[PDB]
Every structure is written in C-alpha cells, then in structure tokens.
Amino acid sequence: TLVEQILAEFQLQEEDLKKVMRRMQKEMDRGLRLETHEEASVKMLPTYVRSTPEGSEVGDFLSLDLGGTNFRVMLVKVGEGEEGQWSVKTKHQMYSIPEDAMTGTAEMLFDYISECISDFLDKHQMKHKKLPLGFTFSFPVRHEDIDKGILLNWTKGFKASGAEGNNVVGLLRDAIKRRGDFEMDVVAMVNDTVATMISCYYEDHQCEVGMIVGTGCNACYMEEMQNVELVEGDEGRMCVNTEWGAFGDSGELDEFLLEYDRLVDESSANPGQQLYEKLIGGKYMGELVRLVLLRLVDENLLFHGEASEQLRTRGAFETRFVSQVESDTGDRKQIYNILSTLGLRPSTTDCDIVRRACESVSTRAAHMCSAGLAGVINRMRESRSEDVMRITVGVDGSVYKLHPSFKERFHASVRRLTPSCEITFIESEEGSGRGAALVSAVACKKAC
Numbered sequence: 286t287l288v289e290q291i292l293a294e295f296q297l298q299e300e301d302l303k304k305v306m307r308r309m310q311k312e313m314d315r316g317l318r319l320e321t322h323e324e325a326s327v328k329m330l331p332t333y334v335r336s337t338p339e340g341s342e343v344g345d346f347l348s349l350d351l352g353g354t355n356f357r358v359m360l361v362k363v364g365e366g367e368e369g370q371w372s373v374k375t376k377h378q379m380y381s382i383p384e385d386a387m388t389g390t391a392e393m394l395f396d397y398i399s400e401c402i403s404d405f406l407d408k409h410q411m412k413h414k415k416l417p418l419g420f421t422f423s424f425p426v427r428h429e430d431i432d433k434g435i436l437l438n439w440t441k442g443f444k445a446s447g448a449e450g451n452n453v454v455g456l457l458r459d460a461i462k463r464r465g466d467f468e469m470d471v472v473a474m475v476n477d478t479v480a481t482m483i484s485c486y487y488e489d490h491q492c493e494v495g496m497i498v499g500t501g502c503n504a505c506y507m508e509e510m511q512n513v514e515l516v517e518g519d520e521g522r523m524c525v526n527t528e529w530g531a532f533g534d535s536g537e538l539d540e541f542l543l544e545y546d547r548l549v550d551e552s553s554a555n556p557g558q559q560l561y562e563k564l565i566g567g568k569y570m571g572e573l574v575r576l577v578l579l580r581l582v583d584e585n586l587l588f589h590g591e592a593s594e595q596l597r598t599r600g601a602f603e604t605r606f607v608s609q610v611e612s613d614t615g616d617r618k619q620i621y622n623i624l625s626t627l628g629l630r631p632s633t634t635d636c637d638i639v640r641r642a643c644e645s646v647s648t649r650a651a652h653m654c655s656a657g658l659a660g661v662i663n664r665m666r667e668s669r670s671e672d673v674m675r676i677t678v679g680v681d682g683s684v685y686k687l688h689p690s691f692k693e694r695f696h697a698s699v700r701r702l703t704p705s706c707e708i709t710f711i712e713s714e715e716g717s718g719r720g721a722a723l724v725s726a727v728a729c730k731k732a733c
C-alpha cells in the first residue's frame with residue numbers, strides 16, 4: 286500500500302484521457318494549417334499517398350525497410366487481383382547495423398545499406414537486374430513528392446551526422462551510384478505507418494488509418510485534401526503522417542509527466558523531443574519500469590533496499606522483460622528468472638511488486654495511446670455523414686502485437702472514447718515490405 290501509492294501515480298481517469306484526446310485533436314489541426322504548421326509539435330506531414338489514382342503497374346519490386354534496429358531488404362511481387370492488386374513477399378534478408386556505422390556520417394550509413402543491397406542481390410542471382418525500389422523509412426520526413434523529401438530529425442536513438450536537412454532518397458541514390466555495382470529505380474519513400482495502412486487496404490477498403498506501437502509510436506490516416514493546406518488541391522484524400530510521437534514537445538502533456546518520464550527524457554538521445562512516444566514506445570518502456578524499480582529500492586520497499594549493478598545500469602531492464610513479467614502464470618517462475626539474470630534474488634513479494642510496476646507502466650502506455658487514436662478517429666468522424674462511421678485501423682509493432690494485455694486494454698479504452706464509430710483493427714502481414722511495394726507499383730504507372 287506504500288507500493289500502491291507510488292504506482293497509483295500512473296493512473297489516468299476517463300477525464301484525463303478525454304483531455305489528452307482533445308489536446309491531440311487541437312495539435313493535429315494546428316499542424317495542418319499554414320499559419321501554424323511550422324511551430325506545430327504534431328507535424329501532420331503530407332505523404333503524397335493519395336486516394337485519387339487509378340491503375341497500377343505489375344511485376345517485381347524491391348522494398349527496403351530502415352528504422353527497426355535491423356535493416357531489411359526484400360523482393361515482392363505485385364500482380365492483378367480483384368478490386369485491386371495482390372502482393373506477396375518472395376525473397377528476404379535481414380542485416381544488423383554496427384556501432385561505428387551509426388556513430389559516423391550519413392554517407393557511411395547509406396554505403397552500409399548499399400553494401401547490404403548488393404549482398405542480397407548476389408545471393409539471389411539478381412545482381413544484374415534493375416527494378417523499381419520502395420523505401421519504408423520510419424522517421425519524420427517533409428516530402429516534396431512521393432520520391433523526394435528531407436529528414437527533419439532522427440528519433441528512437443538514431444544518430445548519424447549530415448542526415449538532418451537532406452533529401453533521404455538523394456542520400457540513397459548517391460550511395461547506389463558510389464557503388465556502381467547495380468542499378469535501382471527509387472520510385473517511393475514511405476513511413477512505416479503508411480506502409481502498414483496500405484498493406485491492409487487490399488483486404489479492407491475501409492482501412493484509412495495506420496498505426497505503429499513498437500520501438501517508437503506513430504499513426505497516419507487519410508485526410509481531406511482541402512484540409513491539407515500544405516499541398517495545393519481539394520480533390521480527394523491524401524495520407525498524412527501525424528508524427529504524434531512529438532506530441533507534448535510544446536508542453537501539452539506537462540501536467541501528466543512523472544519523475545520517471547523526466548528522467549527518461551533527460552537521459553535520451555533526444556532531450557525534450559518525442560515526449561508522447563516516450564510514454565508508450567518500446568524503446569522507453571523497460572527503462573520506465575527500471576526507474577520505477579529503483580525508486581522502490583530507494584524507499585526500501587523492494588529487494589530489501591539493494592539493487593544489483595545490472596539494475597542500476599541504463600537499458601538493462603529490456604522492454605521484452607516487461608512483456609515476459611506480465612506473461613507470468615502466477616508461479617513467479619518467469620519473473621524470478623528475469624530478475625535472477627539481472628543479478629537479483631527476489632522474494633515472493635518482490636516478484637509481485639515487479640509485476641505491479643510493469644502493469645502500471647504498460648497500462649498507462651495503452652491508455653495514452655488510446656487517447657491519440659481516439660483523437661484521430663473522432664477528427665475523421667467530423668468529416669463523415671453516416672450514423673455510425675465504420676473504420677479500419679492497420680497496426681504493427683511488437684508492443685501492440687506481443688504484450689499480453691496491451692492490445693485488449695488499448696481496444697477497450699479506444700472504443701470508450703469513440704462513440705458512434707465501429708472500429709476494426711487489422712494486424713498487417715509484412716506491412717512494411719508489401720506496403721512500400723504497393724505504393725511503388727502505383728507510382729510506377731506514371732513515374733517510371
């Protein structure tokens with residue numbers, strides 16, 4: 286109950302969530318309007334993915350994905366189906382990216398990428414061929430078009446000098462060129478949210494929102510072109526990359542932030558940025574729990590006031606431990622084993638307290654996340670005429686998919702916040718690969 290008072294600080298009431306939801310809708314509006322687009326914490330970035338186009342090229346496409354801890358290269362075949370195109374991943378390969386290839390420059394990084402592409406082509410009797418390439422790039426970008434836009438800044442702990450302010454597609458063409466090895470026709474760069482959204486569209490035409498809850502957290506949704514003041518035109522809809530991860534960066538979340546959030550922020554690669562994401566994303570969630578455990582140790586409430594060397598080092602409480610702790614069946618075997626590995630020797634009640642600390646943090650992530658999505662859905666609701674708006678949300682990310690209860694709490698809370706909306710949630714199958722490819726296919730019809 287001394288424990289419970291500390292953890293209860295993570296609670297959010299219905300009214301707290303409604304306040305976060307209204308504030309998110311307010312920032313989405315400010316991000317879309319010319320007069321406020323520039324100071325907006327929520328950037329609402331036009332993506333040039335549109336509802337208007339007809340016709341799609343068929344054939345084989347290469348898809349890149351950068352923005353996990355792993356970089357992925359795959360081949361995907363697009364062909365002609367019913368009411369649209371099918372797509373399927375045929376060939377694929379994952380690569381890690383080393384320290385010195387990320388402490389360095391952008392040039393170096395994109396060379397590594399180019400080196401990985403060649404490797405994949407070598408290995409697949411492909412080196413000689415030239416194909417349209419789709420680039421899923423999970424970072425905030427200001428687009429000039431479907432095949433051009435600049436990196437605004439790194440998120441999720443990516444460093445690389447000389448990337449911010451530059452055309453990311455340019456940076457990759459410059460690296461393909463500086464290798465001579467192979468020719469590739471970069472036809473489309475998209476965000477992961479957008480890739481996920483697009484990949485759910487084939488099976489569900491109602492899918493107009495894409496969401497990621499993984500290392501980071503973000504969404505995109507189809508906006509009416511008249512509301513997209515940053516792109517001339519009123520015809521049809523364009524996908525907007527909200528970048529809601531940066532919500533709170535102008536102080537909108539100050540009343541809700543905890544000591545643990547301020548500590549995570551100050552110690553991150555990006556002080557004062559991505560504050561909403563720092564409440565939710567798997568890059569931060571284990572670290573939040575860690576900090577909570579340290580506070581309980583210092584109050585002599587956990588591990589008899591003794592923390593191991595491992596518990597005291599940043600990043601040691603991994604986000605996957607939070608999910609494992611919450612998967613524990615009640616026998617405390619999972620919890621004991623995780624803590625033992627961290628050099629602790631926990632009692633029965635220690636294990637239970639650790640469980641509670643995980644649920645408070647993950648439950649707060651789910652609820653916060655729900656308020657942002659509810660804001661996106663209720664904003665869309667305002668432009669729609671039906672009695673009940675039926676909308677499909679495409680989702681990916683290990684926090685959403687793999688955390689035992691996150692998805693259930695998130696669904697219930699979102700639904701509470703969105704009256705007269707019927708919401709269908711679809712988890713993408715190779716959303717990133719296929720989505721990049723499907724957008725490339727359509728862009729090729731005219732672009733290539």
Ligand SMILES: CCc1ncccc1Oc1cc(Sc2ccccn2)cnc1NC(=O)NC
Pocket residue numbers: 333334335336337338368369370431483486487492493507723724725727728
């Ligand atoms: C959800 C936004 C949307 N609604 C309605 C139509 C299109 C549409 O956008 C696309 C869908 C697809 S996949 C697709 C397209 C049609 C049928 C089945 N599958 C690929 N690119 C784009 N857009 C582009 O602008 N491509 C560059």
Ligand SMILES: OC[C@H]1O[C@H](O)[C@H](O)[C@@H](O)[C@@H]1O
Pocket residue numbers: 352422423424425440441476477478497499500501502503504528530562
């Ligand atoms: O990968 C999930 C998200 O992580 C961060 O929020 C990135 O800025 C965003 O672009 C991405 O979509």
